[model samples]
Target: KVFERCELARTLKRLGMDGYRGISLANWMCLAKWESGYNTRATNYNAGDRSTDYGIFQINSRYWCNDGKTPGAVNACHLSCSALLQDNIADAVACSKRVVRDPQGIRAWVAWRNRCQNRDVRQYVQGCGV
Candidate 1:
Protein backbone atom coordinates (compact mmCIF):
# COMPACT_ATOMS: atom_id res chain seq x y z
CA LYS A 1 0.00 0.00 0.00
CA VAL A 2 1.40 3.34 -1.02
CA PHE A 3 -0.21 5.87 1.29
CA GLU A 4 -0.78 9.43 0.28
CA ARG A 5 1.00 12.05 2.35
CA CYS A 6 -1.91 13.37 4.37
CA GLU A 7 -3.44 9.94 4.61
CA LEU A 8 -0.37 8.65 6.39
CA ALA A 9 -0.25 11.73 8.60
CA ARG A 10 -3.87 11.27 9.64
CA THR A 11 -3.36 7.59 10.27
CA LEU A 12 -0.29 8.21 12.36
CA LYS A 13 -2.13 10.82 14.36
CA ARG A 14 -4.99 8.42 14.96
CA LEU A 15 -2.44 5.97 16.24
CA GLY A 16 -1.19 8.54 18.80
CA MET A 17 1.92 9.54 16.88
CA ASP A 18 1.13 13.27 17.19
CA GLY A 19 3.39 13.71 20.21
CA TYR A 20 4.76 10.25 20.78
CA ARG A 21 7.95 10.37 22.81
CA GLY A 22 7.96 14.10 22.19
CA ILE A 23 8.32 13.52 18.49
CA SER A 24 5.80 15.27 16.29
CA LEU A 25 3.60 13.53 13.77
CA ALA A 26 5.20 15.54 10.97
CA ASN A 27 8.56 14.18 11.95
CA TRP A 28 7.21 10.67 11.70
CA MET A 29 5.71 11.58 8.38
CA CYS A 30 8.99 12.95 7.19
CA LEU A 31 10.73 9.79 8.31
CA ALA A 32 8.25 7.66 6.41
CA LYS A 33 8.51 9.94 3.42
CA TRP A 34 12.20 9.31 3.08
CA GLU A 35 12.54 5.82 4.52
CA SER A 36 9.91 4.01 2.48
CA GLY A 37 7.95 6.68 0.62
CA TYR A 38 4.84 5.45 2.43
CA ASN A 39 5.05 2.07 0.74
CA THR A 40 3.99 -0.74 3.06
CA ARG A 41 5.94 -3.48 1.34
CA ALA A 42 9.23 -1.58 1.15
CA THR A 43 12.27 -3.57 2.14
CA ASN A 44 16.01 -2.90 2.01
CA TYR A 45 18.66 -5.51 2.55
CA ASN A 46 21.96 -4.41 4.00
CA ALA A 47 24.73 -6.48 2.54
CA GLY A 48 27.14 -4.98 5.00
CA ASP A 49 25.34 -6.21 8.12
CA ARG A 50 23.42 -9.07 6.56
CA SER A 51 20.18 -7.63 7.91
CA THR A 52 17.06 -6.25 6.34
CA ASP A 53 14.99 -3.15 6.91
CA TYR A 54 11.32 -3.88 6.50
CA GLY A 55 8.08 -2.00 5.95
CA ILE A 56 7.08 1.63 6.20
CA PHE A 57 9.43 2.88 8.83
CA GLN A 58 12.14 0.52 7.70
CA ILE A 59 12.42 -1.21 11.02
CA ASN A 60 15.75 -2.99 11.06
CA SER A 61 16.34 -6.67 11.72
CA ARG A 62 19.52 -6.18 13.68
CA TYR A 63 18.07 -4.72 16.88
CA TRP A 64 14.34 -4.35 16.46
CA CYS A 65 12.51 -7.17 14.68
CA ASN A 66 13.64 -10.73 14.03
CA ASP A 67 14.02 -11.99 10.47
CA GLY A 68 15.61 -15.32 11.52
CA LYS A 69 18.83 -14.50 9.67
CA THR A 70 20.36 -11.40 11.25
CA PRO A 71 23.29 -12.39 13.39
CA GLY A 72 23.01 -11.39 17.05
CA ALA A 73 19.54 -9.96 16.49
CA VAL A 74 17.69 -8.76 19.54
CA ASN A 75 14.07 -8.83 18.29
CA ALA A 76 13.12 -6.28 20.88
CA CYS A 77 9.78 -5.74 19.19
CA HIS A 78 9.10 -9.46 19.64
CA LEU A 79 7.34 -9.78 16.31
CA SER A 80 8.16 -11.23 12.93
CA CYS A 81 9.73 -8.90 10.40
CA SER A 82 7.00 -9.92 8.00
CA ALA A 83 4.47 -8.18 10.21
CA LEU A 84 5.86 -4.81 9.20
CA LEU A 85 4.99 -5.38 5.57
CA GLN A 86 1.26 -5.58 6.17
CA ASP A 87 -0.94 -2.86 4.73
CA ASN A 88 -2.38 -2.26 8.17
CA ILE A 89 0.28 -0.40 10.12
CA ALA A 90 -0.78 -1.41 13.61
CA ASP A 91 2.18 -3.70 14.22
CA ALA A 92 4.57 -1.25 12.67
CA VAL A 93 3.20 1.54 14.81
CA ALA A 94 3.50 -0.58 17.94
CA CYS A 95 7.09 -1.45 17.16
CA SER A 96 7.90 2.20 16.46
CA LYS A 97 6.67 3.17 19.88
CA ARG A 98 9.08 0.71 21.42
CA VAL A 99 11.87 2.10 19.28
CA VAL A 100 11.48 5.67 20.52
CA ARG A 101 11.47 4.44 24.09
CA ASP A 102 15.18 4.14 23.71
CA PRO A 103 17.37 7.13 24.56
CA GLN A 104 17.86 7.81 20.85
CA GLY A 105 14.16 8.55 20.41
CA ILE A 106 13.44 9.13 16.69
CA ARG A 107 17.14 9.51 16.04
CA ALA A 108 17.30 5.75 15.69
CA TRP A 109 16.40 6.31 12.06
CA VAL A 110 19.32 7.92 10.28
CA ALA A 111 17.05 8.97 7.46
CA TRP A 112 15.09 11.15 9.83
CA ARG A 113 18.27 12.86 10.90
CA ASN A 114 19.47 13.50 7.38
CA ARG A 115 16.18 14.60 5.84
CA CYS A 116 13.74 15.56 8.60
CA GLN A 117 15.65 17.09 11.46
CA ASN A 118 15.93 20.88 11.45
CA ARG A 119 13.78 21.06 8.38
CA ASP A 120 10.37 22.50 7.60
CA VAL A 121 8.34 19.34 8.16
CA ARG A 122 5.02 21.17 8.57
CA GLN A 123 4.38 20.50 4.89
CA TYR A 124 3.86 16.87 5.74
CA VAL A 125 0.71 17.40 7.83
CA GLN A 126 -0.29 20.83 6.57
CA GLY A 127 -3.93 20.21 5.63
CA CYS A 128 -4.30 16.69 7.01
CA GLY A 129 -6.48 17.79 9.96
CA VAL A 130 -4.31 15.68 12.15
Candidate 2:
Protein backbone atom coordinates (compact mmCIF):
# COMPACT_ATOMS: atom_id res chain seq x y z
CA LYS A 1 0.00 0.00 0.00
CA VAL A 2 1.33 3.37 -1.00
CA PHE A 3 0.29 6.11 1.42
CA GLU A 4 -0.27 9.73 0.67
CA ARG A 5 1.91 12.05 2.71
CA CYS A 6 -0.69 13.34 5.13
CA GLU A 7 -2.30 9.95 5.40
CA LEU A 8 1.00 8.49 6.47
CA ALA A 9 1.62 11.37 8.81
CA ARG A 10 -1.74 10.94 10.50
CA THR A 11 -1.18 7.22 10.70
CA LEU A 12 2.22 7.61 12.26
CA LYS A 13 0.88 10.09 14.74
CA ARG A 14 -1.82 7.66 15.73
CA LEU A 15 0.91 5.14 16.34
CA GLY A 16 2.76 7.59 18.60
CA MET A 17 5.62 8.45 16.27
CA ASP A 18 5.66 12.11 17.25
CA GLY A 19 8.42 12.78 19.77
CA TYR A 20 9.31 9.14 19.88
CA ARG A 21 12.81 8.88 21.25
CA GLY A 22 13.20 12.62 20.77
CA ILE A 23 12.47 12.25 17.05
CA SER A 24 9.62 14.27 15.60
CA LEU A 25 6.93 13.04 13.29
CA ALA A 26 8.33 15.18 10.51
CA ASN A 27 11.68 13.48 10.87
CA TRP A 28 10.03 10.10 10.59
CA MET A 29 8.14 11.37 7.59
CA CYS A 30 11.38 12.50 6.01
CA LEU A 31 12.97 9.15 6.64
CA ALA A 32 10.07 7.26 5.13
CA LYS A 33 10.00 9.57 2.15
CA TRP A 34 13.61 8.88 1.31
CA GLU A 35 13.73 5.26 2.40
CA SER A 36 10.62 3.79 0.79
CA GLY A 37 8.41 6.62 -0.43
CA TYR A 38 5.67 5.42 1.99
CA ASN A 39 5.14 2.24 0.01
CA THR A 40 4.48 -0.59 2.40
CA ARG A 41 5.76 -3.26 0.06
CA ALA A 42 8.83 -1.41 -1.08
CA THR A 43 12.01 -3.49 -0.94
CA ASN A 44 15.69 -3.07 -1.65
CA TYR A 45 18.31 -5.79 -1.67
CA ASN A 46 21.86 -4.99 -0.69
CA ALA A 47 24.15 -7.09 -2.81
CA GLY A 48 27.08 -6.03 -0.69
CA ASP A 49 25.66 -7.49 2.52
CA ARG A 50 23.23 -10.02 0.99
CA SER A 51 20.51 -8.46 3.13
CA THR A 52 17.21 -6.97 2.06
CA ASP A 53 15.43 -3.89 3.35
CA TYR A 54 11.70 -4.39 3.56
CA GLY A 55 8.56 -2.30 3.85
CA ILE A 56 7.81 1.38 4.42
CA PHE A 57 10.61 2.04 6.86
CA GLN A 58 12.92 -0.39 5.07
CA ILE A 59 13.66 -2.58 8.08
CA ASN A 60 16.74 -4.66 7.36
CA SER A 61 16.83 -8.42 7.28
CA ARG A 62 20.38 -8.53 8.60
CA TYR A 63 19.66 -7.40 12.15
CA TRP A 64 16.05 -6.35 12.54
CA CYS A 65 14.05 -9.14 10.97
CA ASN A 66 14.66 -12.61 9.67
CA ASP A 67 14.24 -13.70 6.07
CA GLY A 68 15.93 -17.06 6.69
CA LYS A 69 18.43 -16.15 3.99
CA THR A 70 20.53 -13.45 5.59
CA PRO A 71 23.50 -15.21 7.03
CA GLY A 72 24.28 -14.45 10.68
CA ALA A 73 21.05 -12.51 11.09
CA VAL A 74 19.91 -11.58 14.60
CA ASN A 75 16.16 -10.96 14.15
CA ALA A 76 16.25 -8.31 16.88
CA CYS A 77 12.71 -7.34 16.02
CA HIS A 78 11.61 -10.95 16.49
CA LEU A 79 9.50 -10.87 13.36
CA SER A 80 9.58 -12.32 9.88
CA CYS A 81 10.69 -9.90 7.20
CA SER A 82 7.39 -10.58 5.45
CA ALA A 83 5.61 -8.90 8.35
CA LEU A 84 7.18 -5.62 7.47
CA LEU A 85 5.57 -5.73 4.01
CA GLN A 86 2.03 -5.73 5.29
CA ASP A 87 -0.31 -2.86 4.57
CA ASN A 88 -0.80 -2.52 8.33
CA ILE A 89 2.24 -0.75 9.71
CA ALA A 90 1.92 -1.72 13.38
CA ASP A 91 4.74 -4.23 13.29
CA ALA A 92 6.96 -1.90 11.35
CA VAL A 93 6.25 0.86 13.85
CA ALA A 94 7.11 -1.37 16.75
CA CYS A 95 10.33 -2.50 15.17
CA SER A 96 11.29 1.06 14.41
CA LYS A 97 10.85 1.87 18.10
CA ARG A 98 13.22 -0.90 18.95
CA VAL A 99 15.72 0.52 16.51
CA VAL A 100 15.70 3.95 18.10
CA ARG A 101 15.94 2.56 21.59
CA ASP A 102 19.62 2.17 20.85
CA PRO A 103 22.06 4.97 21.50
CA GLN A 104 22.26 5.90 17.82
CA GLY A 105 18.59 6.94 18.06
CA ILE A 106 17.23 7.86 14.61
CA ARG A 107 20.68 8.08 13.10
CA ALA A 108 20.49 4.35 12.57
CA TRP A 109 18.95 5.24 9.22
CA VAL A 110 21.60 6.95 7.12
CA ALA A 111 18.89 8.49 4.95
CA TRP A 112 17.68 10.51 7.94
CA ARG A 113 21.18 11.86 8.49
CA ASN A 114 21.82 12.85 4.89
CA ARG A 115 18.35 14.11 4.05
CA CYS A 116 16.61 15.12 7.26
CA GLN A 117 19.24 15.85 9.90
CA ASN A 118 19.22 19.49 11.01
CA ARG A 119 17.18 20.35 7.95
CA ASP A 120 13.77 21.98 7.75
CA VAL A 121 11.56 18.90 7.90
CA ARG A 122 8.30 20.61 8.82
CA GLN A 123 7.13 20.49 5.20
CA TYR A 124 6.64 16.80 5.49
CA VAL A 125 3.88 17.17 8.08
CA GLN A 126 2.92 20.78 7.56
CA GLY A 127 -0.49 20.20 5.95
CA CYS A 128 -1.18 16.86 7.46
CA GLY A 129 -3.26 18.29 10.36
CA VAL A 130 -1.46 15.75 12.48
Candidate 3:
Protein backbone atom coordinates (compact mmCIF):
# COMPACT_ATOMS: atom_id res chain seq x y z
CA LYS A 1 0.00 0.00 0.00
CA VAL A 2 2.76 2.42 0.89
CA PHE A 3 4.68 1.56 -2.24
CA GLU A 4 1.63 1.99 -4.47
CA ARG A 5 0.78 5.28 -2.84
CA CYS A 6 4.36 6.35 -3.42
CA GLU A 7 4.08 5.44 -7.08
CA LEU A 8 0.85 7.37 -7.35
CA ALA A 9 2.36 10.43 -5.72
CA ARG A 10 5.36 10.39 -8.01
CA THR A 11 3.21 9.88 -11.11
CA LEU A 12 0.93 12.71 -10.13
CA LYS A 13 3.96 14.97 -9.96
CA ARG A 14 5.26 13.64 -13.25
CA LEU A 15 1.99 14.43 -14.96
CA GLY A 16 2.26 18.06 -13.77
CA MET A 17 -0.82 17.53 -11.65
CA ASP A 18 -0.13 17.42 -7.93
CA GLY A 19 -3.17 19.37 -6.94
CA TYR A 20 -4.96 16.14 -6.00
CA ARG A 21 -2.20 14.94 -3.72
CA GLY A 22 -4.11 14.34 -0.47
CA ILE A 23 -7.68 13.85 -1.65
CA SER A 24 -6.92 11.58 -4.58
CA LEU A 25 -4.74 9.33 -2.50
CA ALA A 26 -7.40 9.22 0.17
CA ASN A 27 -9.99 8.11 -2.36
CA TRP A 28 -7.81 5.35 -3.77
CA MET A 29 -6.89 4.28 -0.26
CA CYS A 30 -10.54 4.03 0.64
CA LEU A 31 -11.18 1.71 -2.29
CA ALA A 32 -8.09 -0.33 -1.61
CA LYS A 33 -8.93 -0.66 2.04
CA TRP A 34 -12.52 -1.57 1.32
CA GLU A 35 -11.98 -3.94 -1.62
CA SER A 36 -8.76 -5.84 -1.04
CA GLY A 37 -7.02 -4.11 1.86
CA TYR A 38 -4.12 -3.34 -0.48
CA ASN A 39 -3.62 -7.01 -1.30
CA THR A 40 -2.19 -7.23 -4.77
CA ARG A 41 -2.88 -10.93 -4.75
CA ALA A 42 -6.25 -10.80 -3.00
CA THR A 43 -9.21 -11.99 -5.05
CA ASN A 44 -12.94 -12.43 -4.63
CA TYR A 45 -14.71 -15.59 -5.73
CA ASN A 46 -18.11 -15.86 -7.31
CA ALA A 47 -20.94 -18.23 -6.38
CA GLY A 48 -19.54 -20.64 -8.93
CA ASP A 49 -16.09 -20.30 -7.34
CA ARG A 50 -14.85 -18.38 -10.33
CA SER A 51 -11.82 -16.10 -10.01
CA THR A 52 -13.18 -12.60 -10.01
CA ASP A 53 -10.54 -10.30 -8.53
CA TYR A 54 -7.29 -9.48 -10.33
CA GLY A 55 -4.46 -6.91 -10.16
CA ILE A 56 -3.51 -4.47 -7.43
CA PHE A 57 -6.51 -2.23 -8.06
CA GLN A 58 -8.71 -5.30 -7.91
CA ILE A 59 -9.95 -4.69 -11.46
CA ASN A 60 -12.06 -7.49 -12.82
CA SER A 61 -10.28 -9.04 -15.78
CA ARG A 62 -13.57 -9.52 -17.58
CA TYR A 63 -13.76 -5.79 -18.19
CA TRP A 64 -10.13 -4.90 -18.88
CA CYS A 65 -8.83 -8.21 -20.18
CA ASN A 66 -8.00 -6.89 -23.63
CA ASP A 67 -5.63 -4.00 -24.42
CA GLY A 68 -4.83 -1.59 -21.56
CA LYS A 69 -6.45 -4.09 -19.27
CA THR A 70 -5.44 -5.79 -16.07
CA PRO A 71 -1.94 -7.16 -15.58
CA GLY A 72 -3.49 -10.60 -15.07
CA ALA A 73 -0.72 -11.49 -12.63
CA VAL A 74 1.90 -8.85 -13.24
CA ASN A 75 2.07 -5.43 -11.62
CA ALA A 76 3.20 -3.41 -14.60
CA CYS A 77 0.94 -2.79 -17.59
CA HIS A 78 1.65 -1.09 -20.95
CA LEU A 79 0.26 2.42 -21.02
CA SER A 80 0.99 4.79 -18.13
CA CYS A 81 -2.75 5.31 -17.85
CA SER A 82 -3.47 1.76 -16.66
CA ALA A 83 -2.45 2.64 -13.10
CA LEU A 84 -5.73 1.42 -11.66
CA LEU A 85 -5.20 -2.17 -12.83
CA GLN A 86 -1.47 -2.55 -13.28
CA ASP A 87 -0.01 -2.04 -9.84
CA ASN A 88 -0.57 -0.09 -6.66
CA ILE A 89 2.24 2.40 -7.17
CA ALA A 90 2.19 4.34 -10.43
CA ASP A 91 -1.05 2.99 -11.81
CA ALA A 92 -3.16 3.96 -8.84
CA VAL A 93 -1.95 7.53 -9.00
CA ALA A 94 -2.64 7.77 -12.71
CA CYS A 95 -6.10 6.39 -12.24
CA SER A 96 -6.86 9.07 -9.67
CA LYS A 97 -5.76 11.87 -11.97
CA ARG A 98 -7.51 10.42 -15.00
CA VAL A 99 -10.76 10.49 -13.10
CA VAL A 100 -10.22 13.95 -11.62
CA ARG A 101 -9.18 15.40 -14.96
CA ASP A 102 -12.49 14.50 -16.46
CA PRO A 103 -15.42 16.89 -16.74
CA GLN A 104 -16.71 15.50 -13.45
CA GLY A 105 -13.44 14.29 -12.01
CA ILE A 106 -12.89 17.03 -9.47
CA ARG A 107 -16.53 17.00 -8.53
CA ALA A 108 -16.57 13.26 -8.07
CA TRP A 109 -13.49 13.28 -5.88
CA VAL A 110 -14.74 16.05 -3.60
CA ALA A 111 -18.25 14.67 -3.59
CA TRP A 112 -17.13 11.76 -1.46
CA ARG A 113 -16.43 14.20 1.37
CA ASN A 114 -19.02 16.90 0.75
CA ARG A 115 -21.81 14.56 -0.29
CA CYS A 116 -21.98 16.24 -3.69
CA GLN A 117 -23.46 19.29 -2.01
CA ASN A 118 -20.84 21.53 -3.59
CA ARG A 119 -20.76 21.68 -7.33
CA ASP A 120 -17.20 22.92 -7.65
CA VAL A 121 -14.16 22.17 -5.54
CA ARG A 122 -12.77 25.60 -6.14
CA GLN A 123 -15.77 26.87 -4.26
CA TYR A 124 -14.37 25.51 -1.00
CA VAL A 125 -10.80 26.52 -1.59
CA GLN A 126 -9.61 28.70 1.33
CA GLY A 127 -13.20 28.94 2.56
CA CYS A 128 -14.51 30.98 -0.34
CA GLY A 129 -17.28 29.78 -2.64
CA VAL A 130 -16.25 32.13 -5.40
Candidate 4:
Protein backbone atom coordinates (compact mmCIF):
# COMPACT_ATOMS: atom_id res chain seq x y z
CA LYS A 1 0.00 0.00 0.00
CA VAL A 2 2.76 2.43 0.92
CA PHE A 3 4.78 1.85 -2.21
CA GLU A 4 1.73 2.02 -4.47
CA ARG A 5 0.55 5.34 -3.09
CA CYS A 6 4.04 6.80 -3.20
CA GLU A 7 4.21 5.98 -6.88
CA LEU A 8 0.78 7.47 -7.34
CA ALA A 9 1.97 10.76 -5.89
CA ARG A 10 4.03 11.32 -9.02
CA THR A 11 1.07 10.99 -11.36
CA LEU A 12 -1.33 12.87 -9.11
CA LYS A 13 0.91 15.91 -9.24
CA ARG A 14 -0.31 16.34 -12.79
CA LEU A 15 -3.79 14.82 -12.83
CA GLY A 16 -6.16 17.43 -11.36
CA MET A 17 -4.08 19.62 -9.11
CA ASP A 18 -2.64 22.80 -10.64
CA GLY A 19 0.97 21.99 -11.42
CA TYR A 20 1.33 20.30 -8.05
CA ARG A 21 2.73 23.60 -6.70
CA GLY A 22 1.94 23.38 -3.01
CA ILE A 23 0.70 19.80 -3.04
CA SER A 24 3.23 17.59 -1.31
CA LEU A 25 3.91 14.00 -2.38
CA ALA A 26 4.55 12.74 1.12
CA ASN A 27 1.16 13.99 2.26
CA TRP A 28 -0.62 11.40 0.10
CA MET A 29 1.06 8.53 1.86
CA CYS A 30 0.49 10.22 5.18
CA LEU A 31 -3.24 10.32 4.60
CA ALA A 32 -3.28 6.75 3.28
CA LYS A 33 -1.45 5.66 6.37
CA TRP A 34 -4.00 7.31 8.59
CA GLU A 35 -7.07 6.29 6.61
CA SER A 36 -6.27 2.65 5.88
CA GLY A 37 -2.80 2.12 7.28
CA TYR A 38 -1.69 1.35 3.69
CA ASN A 39 -4.02 -1.61 3.39
CA THR A 40 -5.83 -1.41 0.11
CA ARG A 41 -8.14 -4.29 0.92
CA ALA A 42 -8.55 -3.43 4.58
CA THR A 43 -12.08 -2.98 5.84
CA ASN A 44 -13.19 -0.80 8.72
CA TYR A 45 -15.40 -3.52 10.16
CA ASN A 46 -14.22 -7.06 10.57
CA ALA A 47 -17.44 -8.77 9.42
CA GLY A 48 -21.19 -8.78 10.14
CA ASP A 49 -20.49 -5.36 11.66
CA ARG A 50 -21.60 -2.20 9.91
CA SER A 51 -20.66 0.47 12.35
CA THR A 52 -17.03 0.62 11.26
CA ASP A 53 -16.17 1.80 7.76
CA TYR A 54 -13.38 0.63 5.44
CA GLY A 55 -11.21 1.40 2.43
CA ILE A 56 -8.35 3.87 2.12
CA PHE A 57 -10.34 6.64 3.76
CA GLN A 58 -12.33 4.25 5.86
CA ILE A 59 -15.33 5.45 3.87
CA ASN A 60 -18.49 3.57 4.53
CA SER A 61 -18.30 0.49 2.35
CA ARG A 62 -22.04 0.34 1.93
CA TYR A 63 -22.01 3.78 0.32
CA TRP A 64 -18.63 4.03 -1.35
CA CYS A 65 -17.14 0.72 -2.39
CA ASN A 66 -18.44 -1.22 -5.41
CA ASP A 67 -20.67 1.71 -6.30
CA GLY A 68 -19.80 1.78 -9.99
CA LYS A 69 -16.85 3.96 -9.17
CA THR A 70 -13.43 3.30 -10.57
CA PRO A 71 -12.78 0.53 -8.12
CA GLY A 72 -16.34 -0.77 -8.01
CA ALA A 73 -17.74 -1.89 -11.31
CA VAL A 74 -20.86 -3.83 -10.30
CA ASN A 75 -20.26 -4.67 -6.69
CA ALA A 76 -21.39 -2.13 -4.13
CA CYS A 77 -20.06 -3.76 -1.00
CA HIS A 78 -16.40 -4.57 -1.53
CA LEU A 79 -13.39 -2.88 -3.12
CA SER A 80 -11.24 -4.00 -5.99
CA CYS A 81 -7.66 -3.25 -7.03
CA SER A 82 -8.90 -0.72 -9.56
CA ALA A 83 -10.42 1.35 -6.82
CA LEU A 84 -7.23 1.14 -4.89
CA LEU A 85 -4.97 2.33 -7.71
CA GLN A 86 -7.16 4.69 -9.73
CA ASP A 87 -9.45 6.21 -7.17
CA ASN A 88 -7.30 6.23 -4.07
CA ILE A 89 -5.01 9.10 -5.08
CA ALA A 90 -7.69 11.57 -6.11
CA ASP A 91 -9.96 10.60 -3.28
CA ALA A 92 -7.30 11.11 -0.68
CA VAL A 93 -6.06 14.34 -2.25
CA ALA A 94 -9.48 15.92 -2.55
CA CYS A 95 -10.40 14.99 0.99
CA SER A 96 -7.17 16.37 2.32
CA LYS A 97 -7.62 19.56 0.32
CA ARG A 98 -10.94 20.07 2.02
CA VAL A 99 -9.15 19.83 5.32
CA VAL A 100 -6.35 22.23 4.31
CA ARG A 101 -8.55 24.72 2.51
CA ASP A 102 -8.90 28.06 4.30
CA PRO A 103 -7.12 31.30 4.97
CA GLN A 104 -4.70 28.99 6.72
CA GLY A 105 -2.83 26.04 5.13
CA ILE A 106 -1.66 22.47 5.74
CA ARG A 107 -1.10 23.43 9.33
CA ALA A 108 -4.82 23.91 9.54
CA TRP A 109 -5.40 20.25 8.76
CA VAL A 110 -2.60 19.24 11.11
CA ALA A 111 -4.34 21.00 13.96
CA TRP A 112 -7.81 20.02 12.84
CA ARG A 113 -7.00 16.33 12.60
CA ASN A 114 -5.69 16.46 16.12
CA ARG A 115 -8.93 17.96 17.42
CA CYS A 116 -11.26 16.13 15.04
CA GLN A 117 -12.45 13.36 17.35
CA ASN A 118 -11.82 12.18 20.87
CA ARG A 119 -10.72 8.60 20.30
CA ASP A 120 -7.80 6.34 19.48
CA VAL A 121 -7.14 7.53 15.94
CA ARG A 122 -3.74 7.65 14.33
CA GLN A 123 -2.60 11.06 13.06
CA TYR A 124 -1.89 10.26 9.41
CA VAL A 125 -1.81 13.91 8.39
CA GLN A 126 0.99 14.48 10.86
CA GLY A 127 2.95 11.23 10.52
CA CYS A 128 3.16 11.46 6.72
CA GLY A 129 4.88 14.83 7.01
CA VAL A 130 2.04 16.40 5.12
TM-scores for all predictions: 0.98, 0.98, 0.39, 0.39
What tens-digit string does per-residue lDDT give for candidate 4 at 10-63?
444554543243645445445455666566555555355343344454544343
Candidate 1: tens digits of C-alpha lDDT, residues 1-130: 9999998988899898889999999999999999999999999999999999999999999998989999988899999999999999999999999999999999999999999999999999999888
Error of 4 at 34 (Å): 1.7
What's the TM for model 3?
A: 0.39
What lDDT tens digits, residue by residue, belong to model 2 across residues 2-102?
99999999999999999999999999999999999999999999999999999999999999999999989899999999999999999999999999999
Candidate 4 residue runs with Cα over 4 Å from true position:
1-5, 17-26, 46-49, 62-112, 115-130
Q: Stretches of candidate 3 above 4 Å error?
A: 1-23, 48-51, 66-88, 92-130
Clashes of each: 0, 0, 3, 5
Clashes of 4: 5
lDDT of candidate 4? 0.44
lDDT of each: 0.95, 0.96, 0.42, 0.44
For model 2, what is the C-alpha lDDT against the true structure?
0.96
Q: What does candidate 1 score on TM? A: 0.98
- Pairs with steric clashes in candidate 1: none
Across 1-130, the per-residue lDDT of candidate 3 in tens digits comes to 3334445434434655444644433344444444555555555544443335444445443332223333343322223322344443455445445445555654443324453232243322222111
